[PDB]
Write a protein that binds this ligand. Structure first.
Ligand SMILES: O=C(O)Cc1ccccc1Nc1c(Cl)cccc1Cl
Ligand SMILES: O=C(O)Cc1ccccc1Nc1c(Cl)cccc1Cl
Length: 580
């Protein structure tokens, strides 16, 4: 009868309101908080009426119809969102699609800087309004953020203020917590956004393949039936969440967690800790669970995948099940491979069968199929080792610098703030991944790389500037990283005209916290490359060293600006001689 009543009944009022606030903030990213609150309360009032009498008027409409109808009542819709008032002319599902298109991946809203006294005050004042605020602020900023996980993060955010606002050192307790939390949020947003990008750009089959490979590594004791089931269900959850159907998404998510925990003994022994937990923590723990130990009864794969004489008939009869089975088997025994690598191995298996089966004696041809995986494996392994050796030698900041230069050369048309952001993110990947046990570094690195590359691709959809990026971003999901790695200096690139101001620092840099100081220097680095694209990485490092020395000296001077004004312009000119 009434979907809205059904979801209201299933989720309860608290989770329902939270999810509806999230969905509205993601769809209308510029509205003030107070106004979204009103819309939520009205939707929720309706849901309560409907739960009382489902026969009642309009109780029978779709969620998207009801929710889209609300969004369309917003005051100043045409002033604030010029592009969205046309959407309101349309019916479902055409209206939702239109809303989905308008979501803004880089709204560029002010940075959320933890102010512990002003926030503790607001929290003590009204914790409900304060937590609502956190849902709204994050959601607007990350419009494909995994809705139910955001509620989870609100619990953490609430726990942080609960523990820290009474403390002796309130800023000392709190600032490191909110910083860790923000890192976790950024990572989670990027993961989810890759899933939504994958549905958008490559389709559900790609998402399923990704998930089969990843879940098989996580749950290598599970049989293919159980993996298939989980994948099918998990794919439907994320498809709903990526489509804006957050209530349906959350409900289906809760059903999957329930299933997983009832079957935990045949899925993974690491799930025991997760299943002993309240609802949102449970789902979160499942989503993040570590990989189980390999069972001792993993089957040898040659017999079915390389030696069987009827492989060409099985491949032809049920490609999807046969290849899926291959992917499940190979992935469960390879937690030391990245997901994308496993997908490349699966595509190579597929292509080898295609080739061998259109041939005189196929079996003598596909006998050696596993041997074709070797180079796919060895190349990223040596890339990771080389990158991690560099990180360990130079540290995060200089590793970031190296990546900035690398990516600026590959795509000098991209805006400096984007290049800096991706290079900085890539350096953080190094900090995360390079210190792991050595068998974990390839999957950690490549998997996280995929998140950063996807960010760049998402931004480029919004603001296209390079055909080379478009091609890497759209050709093949599993080949994206290798495609980016293979990019070299864009040789058709005309060096950006020199503007001395870009390289000209002033005493204002001296008051910045370290990370913002680095960003300024990294921005100037990216600009050096744009103006001198053939400068070598070693020249660039020297010049950047000369700039950092100059900044540090002038920042410690008696008269900071006189220092910057005297010495700056010499450095700016001589630095150009030191490049290309
Ligand atoms: O960057 C590349 O193209 C090489 C490569 C290949 C596979 C996986 C990772 C990396 N690079 C890499 C690594 Cl291994 C760690 C931190 C940051 C980066 Cl960019
Ligand atoms: O990109 C690399 O291969 C690392 C590399 C090696 C030698 C010299 C410089 C660099 N990278 C690099 C750059 Cl390009 C700028 C500033 C600081 C560093 Cl460590």
């Amino acid at each position: 009868k009434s979907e809205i009543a059904h979801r209201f009944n299933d989720l309860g009022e608290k989770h329902f309101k939270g999810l509806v606030l999230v969905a509205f903030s993601q769809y209308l990213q510029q509205c003030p908080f107070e106004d979204h609150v009103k819309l939520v309360n009205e939707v929720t009032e309706f849901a309560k009426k409907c739960a009382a009498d489902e026969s009642a008027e309009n109780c029978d409409k779709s969620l998207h119809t009801l929710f889209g109808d609300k969004l369309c009542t917003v005051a100043t819709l045409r002033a604030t969102y010029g592009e969205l008032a046309d959407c309101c002319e349309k019916q479902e599902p055409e209206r939702n699609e239109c809303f989905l298109t308008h979501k803004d991946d880089h709204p560029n809203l002010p940075k959320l800087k933890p102010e512990p006294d002003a926030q503790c005050a607001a929290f003590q004042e009204d914790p409900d309004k304060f937590l609502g605020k956190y849902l709204y602020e994050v959601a607007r900023r990350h419009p494909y953020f995994y809705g139910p996980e955001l509620l989870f993060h609100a619990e953490e955010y609430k726990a942080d203020f609960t523990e820290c606002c009474p403390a002796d050192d309130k800023a000392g307790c709190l600032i490191p917590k909110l910083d860790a939390l923000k890192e976790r949020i950024l990572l989670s947003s990027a993961k989810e956004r890759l899933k939504c990008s994958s549905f958008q750009n490559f389709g559900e089959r790609a998402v399923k393949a990704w998930s089969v490979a990843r879940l098989s590594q996580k749950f290598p004791k599970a049989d293919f039936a159980e993996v298939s089931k989980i994948v099918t269900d998990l794919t439907k959850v994320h498809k709903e969440c990526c489509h804006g159907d957050l209530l349906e998404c959350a409900d289906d998510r809760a059903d999957l967690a329930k299933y997983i925990c009832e079957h935990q003994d045949s899925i993974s022994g690491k799930l025991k800790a997760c299943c002993d937990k309240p609802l949102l923590q449970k789902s979160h723990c499942i989503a993040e669970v570590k990989e189980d130990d390999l069972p001792s009864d993993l089957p040898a794969l040659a017999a079915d995948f390389a030696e069987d004489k009827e492989i060409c008939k099985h491949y032809k009869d049920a490609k999807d099940v046969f290849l899926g089975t291959f992917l499940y088997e190979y992935s469960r025994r390879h937690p030391d491979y990245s997901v994308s690598l496993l997908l490349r191995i699966a595509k190579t298996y597929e292509a080898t069968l295609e080739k061998c089966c259109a041939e005189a004696d196929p079996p003598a041809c596909y006998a050696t199929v596993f041997d074709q995986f070797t180079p796919l494996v060895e190349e990223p392994k040596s890339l990771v080792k080389k990158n991690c050796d560099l990180f360990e030698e130079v540290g995060e900041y200089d590793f970031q610098n190296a990546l900035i230069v690398r990516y600026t050369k590959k795509a000098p048309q991209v805006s400096t703030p984007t290049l800096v952001e991706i290079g900085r993110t890539l350096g953080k990947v190094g900090s995360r991944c390079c210190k792991l046990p050595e068998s974990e570094r390839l999957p950690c690195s490549e998997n996280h790389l995929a998140l950063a590359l996807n960010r760049l691709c998402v931004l480029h959809e919004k603001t296209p500037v390079s055909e080379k990026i478009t091609k890497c971003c759209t050709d093949s999901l599993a080949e994206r990283r290798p495609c980016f790695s293979a990019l070299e200096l864009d040789e058709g690139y005309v060096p950006k005209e020199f503007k001395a101001e870009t390289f000209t620092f002033h005493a204002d840099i001296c008051t910045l916290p370290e990370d913002e100081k680095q960003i300024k220097k990294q921005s100037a680095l990216a600009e050096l490359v744009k103006h001198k694209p053939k400068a070598t990485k070693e020249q660039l490092k020297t010049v950047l060293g000369n700039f950092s020395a100059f900044v540090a000296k002038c920042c410690g001077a008696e008269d900071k600006e006189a220092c910057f004004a005297e010495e700056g312009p010499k450095l700016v000119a001589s630095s150009q001689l030191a490049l290309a």
